[PDB]
Design a protein around this ligand. Sequence first.
Ligand SMILES: CC(C)C[C@H](NP(=O)(O)O[C@@H]1O[C@@H](C)[C@H](O)[C@@H](O)[C@H]1O)C(=O)N[C@@H](Cc1c[nH]c2ccccc12)C(=O)O
Ligand SMILES: [Ca+2]
Ligand SMILES: [Ca+2]
Ligand SMILES: [Ca+2]
Ligand SMILES: [Ca+2]
Ligand SMILES: [Zn+2]
Length: 316
Amino acid sequence: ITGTSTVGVGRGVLGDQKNINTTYSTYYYLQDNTRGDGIFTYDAKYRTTLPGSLWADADNQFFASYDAPAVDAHYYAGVTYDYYKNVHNRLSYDGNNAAIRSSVHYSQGYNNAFWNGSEMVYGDGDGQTFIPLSGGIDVVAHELTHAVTDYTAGLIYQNESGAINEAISDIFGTLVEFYANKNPDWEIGEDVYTPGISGDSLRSMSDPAKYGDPDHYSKRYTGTQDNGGVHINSGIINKAAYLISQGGTHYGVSVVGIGRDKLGKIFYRALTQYLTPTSNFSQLRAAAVQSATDLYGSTSQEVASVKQAFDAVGVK
Ligand SMILES: CC(C)C[C@H](NP(=O)(O)O[C@@H]1O[C@@H](C)[C@H](O)[C@@H](O)[C@H]1O)C(=O)N[C@@H](Cc1c[nH]c2ccccc12)C(=O)O
Ligand SMILES: [Ca+2]
Ligand SMILES: [Ca+2]
Ligand SMILES: [Ca+2]
Ligand SMILES: [Ca+2]
Ligand SMILES: [Zn+2]
C-alpha cells in the first residue's frame, strides 16, 4: 500500500498495550515503513489460503479481541528486525531488507506457527493447549530465524542438520526475548502454552529433560517421527548453548559461562560463515570452535568454554 506513515495503538494477546507502526490510505493498514522494505501483517480469516488480506482498520486503534494476534505478530516482527540489525548488523532475513510478511488467524484452532519459505504463519490455538501463537516473542523470533537459516546455512529440515536448524531458532528466539527484556528465560513458548497450567513450557533449554528431550548425544532419538526428531534432538544443542552462556556442571563436565552476548556472536558467525545444508552435530562443534577462535583467539576462555560445552553433551 502507498500512504502516510503514522503510528497506532493496540493491545496484545497478553492484554498489554503497545504502539504499532501503520500506514494510512483511506484505511489504516498494518504496514510498517520504518523497517527495511516493510513489515506487513495479514488476516487469513480462519482459512488456509495465504497470505489473506493486508490488515485494515478504520480508526488506528487495535483493541478488539480479533486484533490481538495481529498487533503482536506485527510488533514482535519489528523487534526481531531490530535485534538483527542492531546486534548483528543484518538487514532483514535475507541481509537485503526484504519485506517481512506474517498472516494471523490461520485455520481454526490451529496449535502451531511456521515459516513456510516465504512468510510466517500463526494459528490461534485451540484455547487450551495454546493461545494465539504470536503472543510469544520467542515464538515470533524462532520463526523469523528460520528465514535467516534458509538464506544462510540452509540447513536441511531433517535428521541432525534439522535439529541444528531447530536449535538455532530456539537460541535466537531466546536471545531476542532477552534483548527485549520481556520476562526473559531459557524456556520456549511459556507465554502462549497451556493457559491453564503455570510454570510450564513447550521445551526447556536449561534442562531439556524436564519434558523428555535428550540432554546428551547418547540419548539422541534415532527414529522416524518428527523428521527424525528435529524438535527432539534440538535439546542436545540447546543444552550446549545454555552451558556456554551460563556455565554449569553437566554429567560431571564443568563449563565456565561466557554470557549471552558472546553466545549470540559465536553462533551467528557459525551460522553465516561455517554451516552448510548438510552439517551435522560434529560439524556444528567445529564451526563453533572456529568462530570462537576467529573472534577471541585459540587460546581464549571463549574457545575453552565452547569445547567443554560440547564435551558436556557428548558431541565429539
Ligand atoms: C515454536 C513452535 C510454537 C512452532 C514450531 N514449528 P516450526 O519449528 O516452525 O515447524 C515445524 O516444522 C515444519 C516443517 C512444520 O511444517 C511446522 O508445523 C512444524 O511441524 C515447533 O516448535 N513445532 C513442533 C512443536 C509443536 C508446536 N505445536 C505443537 C502442537 C502439538 C505437538 C507439537 C507441537 C512440532 O511441530 O512438532
Ligand atoms: Ca480499530
Ligand atoms: Ca519469557
Ligand atoms: Ca521463553
Ligand atoms: Ca502454561
Ligand atoms: Zn522451528
